[PDB]
């Protein structure tokens, strides 16, 4: 088993693949796509920063071209997770 | 809501630095003590997988060899995502 780690892994999976549903993205999402996760996931409110959002967001799909592939959004989730470096160090 | 994401994110991110605590606190985890990581956190009953574990420790480490890096492991937790495509279905 992996209860711990696999409800957390899932949570990432079940997030993606919610929004893959959008347009049936299969293991991927698309640029915009992914904007409608972080609007709907990340509810900044500040809207103003949604600057940042599209730098992110062209971060993640740049991985492959105009879509986050599944992989690439794990990966940047850690990228993510190490600029949020707080959370790493406690 | 960003809750969902964030605990998620946090437990891979807490299993990590909980390890690497041992060493000391860095964004790098080593071979051996990743195993120590798996066996605790990942409860694989099936212990005869051990095979297997040391084989995935390999792909882990083989980053550079000697240790698995933060940003590696969280993509490898994305490959290993991908292999439970299961969850990706569904």
Redesign the interface.
Same mark, same amino acid.
Request: charged share 30%.
């Given at each position: 088993?992996?209860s711990?780690?696999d $409800? +957390?892994? *899932?949570?990432?999976?079940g997030?993606?693949?919610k929004y893959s549903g959008k347009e049936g993205d299969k293991?991927t999402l698309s640029k915009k796509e992914l904007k409608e996760l972080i609007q709907k996931?990340?509810?900044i409110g500040s809207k103003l920063q949604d600057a940042e959002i599209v730098k992110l967001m062209d971060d993640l799909d740049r991985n492959k071209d105009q879509e986050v592939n599944? $992989?690439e959004?794990?990966?940047f989730? *850690? +990228?993510? +997770?190490?600029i949020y470096n707080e +959370?790493?160090?406690?």
């Amino acid at each position: 088993m992996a209860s711990p780690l696999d $409800q +957390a892994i *899932g949570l990432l999976i079940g997030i993606f693949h919610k929004y893959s549903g959008k347009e049936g993205d299969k293991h991927t999402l698309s640029k915009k796509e992914l904007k409608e996760l972080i609007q709907k996931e990340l509810t900044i409110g500040s809207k103003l920063q949604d600057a940042e959002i599209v730098k992110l967001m062209d971060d993640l799909d740049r991985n492959k071209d105009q879509e986050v592939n599944f $992989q690439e959004y794990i990966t940047f989730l *850690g +990228a993510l +997770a190490m600029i949020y470096n707080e +959370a790493l160090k406690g």
